[model samples]
Target: GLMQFTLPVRLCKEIELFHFDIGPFENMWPGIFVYMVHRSCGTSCFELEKLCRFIMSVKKNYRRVPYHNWKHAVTVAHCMYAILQNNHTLFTDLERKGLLIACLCHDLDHRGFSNSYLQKFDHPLAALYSTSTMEQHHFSQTVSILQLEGHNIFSTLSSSEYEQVLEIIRKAIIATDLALYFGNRKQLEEMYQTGSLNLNNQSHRDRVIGLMMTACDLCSVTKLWPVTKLTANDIYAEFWAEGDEMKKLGIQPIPMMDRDKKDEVPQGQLGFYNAVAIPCYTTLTQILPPTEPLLKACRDNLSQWEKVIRGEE
Candidate 1:
């Protein structure tokens, strides 16, 4: 398992040392990313240079839209990195690499839009993939970057290894869609409740990976109260902006996205807690056990959302 690779060491050490605030990288997360890959996974020097370019390219391509931009990618990847830092032993080297890359690229080129919007507008992405339209496009964007001349950070892996990692990357990337999140969580919940989930099983691990993808995707829900609120505001800012556009198009926007209903959103987020966030982190904690803090954090945020929803805040 020779790195197929430091400053590289310093770069990675900065990741471990600084965690999310490793500032010099800017959108050049490939610096910290490659460092992380080298430290844990043993990527080569050639791959390191390529990965740096790939990451910068990926980050540069992110839209300046509300929350799904490069900053969002960093936030999600930061969560993934934290999770892997604690649970690194749970996955194989390749699987660990998959988790890192997937989270980083999950929303590679988001247009500050949802699948429903894309589908409704008959957006080219929706036309391209009948399901997981946006997610499919994100992965496609990831591949396109990797296919670039100076890209292919995964090049060091064997042909079979590359394909295997690609599959995990695909699943992890698409799992970011909340549409798929619910269904995946339902499956995992049943398995956990039935005592049928065995982490030792590859299928079981894949399911865990899928759930983890959602966990990272929605990391704000589990953040401290301040961050959760701020991130929620930013997210809804994007939503409301979309609503604004739809208004101009004479299309009634989704309630959450409709700016006129801004007051209703705290309540809407409460529903998200019950319908999406709580159950997601709850099930994840049940699976990882070490992840219980995330569940607690999300619950705390829900309480805040409830206070706001009830007009008590």
Candidate 2:
């Protein structure tokens, strides 16, 4: 398995702190890491571990871009843990496990840009699959590796139990698409108004799982003070880098911020966060109080961005 039981001393300290917040899931961590590695390499854990080691061995070959790096993966993982804790009554143990697995694998092998950028650049993955297909493939790759005979984490389950786990993982991971954010939120609000969620309703299960994953992905806004600031800065930097790349290629970037200007970093992000992230996350927190931290985090990050716009940062 991708059990690189050899964590660096620095990473061990960070993981230790993360564990304190999320509590210990000793038996499951290896499975979660292997799932992520499988999504990135489309291989078994052993093979993916070798690939990871090889990448590290090369000189400056393994790059962790600001938006879609190890940090983002870890952040999402943390968010999933927080969400599960807050919504504990609503989920089964299997569902909670599935969520952590999904969060870890959702952004595997990200290319540091949005799906639009990949389409603009004629990236092979974009050409080979629809945007949704790419996400499904990543999820499937993770599932495939995890279910490999003796390596399967669900191996201890009975046939029915195994299917239940698979269903939860598939539903949760496929729901991570940011494009579906508004629609998913609307559906959740409708369900909330209906009094109680009917567990027997198959359609509601999909909606709930999708909203759950969406909530976790955007939960960065609810993070603690310094962590929120750091995450916001990472997102701003990635968006700016993409804008710069677009300018070089003579392509118009996404219209989030001041696209016509030379210095497109903080302005674009500030505009996007204020108009997009804030409203979306605000609506989410209304439905789920656990998401309040995320809402506050976004509010605080926006203030920081305002200062940056005013050349304070």
Candidate 3:
């Protein structure tokens, strides 16, 4: 339902007003309010369209950045949709909206490399907001934009409703921290063992929210055949670019993409997929059956990459 349609151009323009330099915040007020109302009411078309708008706004704002562009947002959104379809009964309309909104806006202003990049560069975003910089900042920015005087979307909500919305948004956004990976996986496993997961009877909305967000974030490995290959290549290229930056700063670069003469060799396509991507996605599919087909596709793609890497194709 969230991936059914493209965002309207007018909505895109409205989001741009809040996120970019060339937009008129005053003129986009009505459109922004309408979008929020649509989200609050759980209109699938409006929810998806608004998500597209949020993503395209981020894309437009960060087009020149290497890794955190529209492609990443689109990939995350696609993965989110897949998880939602597989776990449809677990979430209500509002919860679904919160999850979708969080996914779309999670990295609205990302600047290429990971949070490590910010810390390494001594960036203010890392220094002042390091506890949960990216996610916190992104949520604050979205909330601030939505609360612009005449454009305040939550103006119509009761205090209780507002708090509910805010809590859901904050939880979903905060769950994106990579530092929570271990805790999240452990929690999921515990839930499974405790009989807390019943596709038909359980209403574990919060757990679903967290799992879906993390799963989508890691879904690059479960992509369709060609798309997975392309994404892997893009990751390799980004790694090389970061390594180049690190080298210039007299730092030891990560090994996966180092073309330089060094003891740390790059793990070309075959080795990387077999050792890293394949095992990761295989484990993921074992936990989530809806992803099994996607995992199979990834394996097939991995085989093709292996042949190409070994010069046997």
Candidate 4:
């Protein structure tokens, strides 16, 4: 398979020989994971070889979908990394590693189709899981890679420790499903409004991590203009691909998914800004003050999208 060929061994080799800066790169994807996993697990305790193999395998499993491929996975992971780096006291080492792995594998093997598409077509995954079909599969895929020989990055942990991290990974990955976001958002917002958001509480911590996953998943909407534009294009490309399939099956896609209605993209994006992206980031900034920049970025992008709508740009 061509998957092995995509392995960033060249960067991996150089990573051990010298300090690898993490500013950004398209080709140093695996190297980025190497640095992050090392920093998260500590330099002396974890197996570099197993971590690299696990990352490579995860990358290989992500299909070449327009928006949900390896690039998106790594981007989400990087977003989590940035957030964790700034607020080091917020989560435990195990929690940090679990969230990173979950972000990196959140959309594994995505077919560029939505959950509704899968359920409507009675896809086997949909039949197996009544809800969060793809998310459950994503976590299963994460575990599958972990179980592979020499690919268990957490192999060094004790039995109980291993179970804890796995639980965190499962919860974090499952939270990425947008179906659960509304409930998560509502609960977290009320917690924030009433000052009941105690980080010391287990359920409170879980809700925070869940909403954090949502923020990272939609981080593209808060990126710089050119980057956000490109990401949105990729998203619509994936959506319209599903729309085309629906059309072939004699069904109609919503306006946002309809390729014939490209003009409505700005309108759809504006709706997303109002309902999903803004509120999600707003809640995150209140929980973690350093994330205020993210909230600002969302507003900045919103105004830009507004200009596009108003023909002002």
Candidate that scores best on lDDT: 4
lDDT of 4 by residue, 70-90 (tens): 888987886787688768787
Q: lDDT for every model?
A: 0.78, 0.60, 0.57, 0.83
Best by TM-score: 4
Per-residue lDDT tens digits for candidate 3, residues 126-200, read: 877876677787777667545544434345556886778777778777777767645665665666678776545
> Cα lDDT for residue 269, model 3?
56
TM-scores of all candidate predictions against the true structure: 0.88, 0.70, 0.69, 0.91
Give the Cα-based TM-score of candidate 2 against the true structure: 0.70
Clashing pairs in 1: 3-42, 3-44, 4-44, 5-43, 5-44, 5-45, 6-9
Candidates in descending TM-score order: 4, 1, 2, 3
In model 4, what is the error at residue 132, expressed in angstroms? 0.4
User: Which has the better lDDT: candidate 3, or candidate 4?
Assistant: 4
Give the better candidate number (1 or 4) by lDDT. Answer: 4
Candidate that beats the other on TM-score, 1 or 2, i.e. the better one: 1
Candidate 3 deviant stretches above 4 angstroms: 1-59, 149-157, 194-207, 257-291, 305-310
* Weakest ten-residue segment in model 4 by summed lDDT: 14-23
Deviating ranges (above 4 Å) for candidate 2: 1-63, 147-150, 194-200, 244-249, 255-267, 307-313
Candidate 4 local distance difference test against the native: 0.83
Q: Is candidate 1 or candidate 3 better by lDDT?
A: 1
Summarize candidate 2's per-residue lDDT along 1-313 as a digit string, tens digits: 4334444455445432222222234334444444433433234423544433322322122137776654455457666665565665766666665666567667666666777777777877777767764466556666655644444555546799778878877777677877776787777677777866565687876776787677667666555546656666677667768887787779776654223553665676576677557866666676667657666777787787688779787
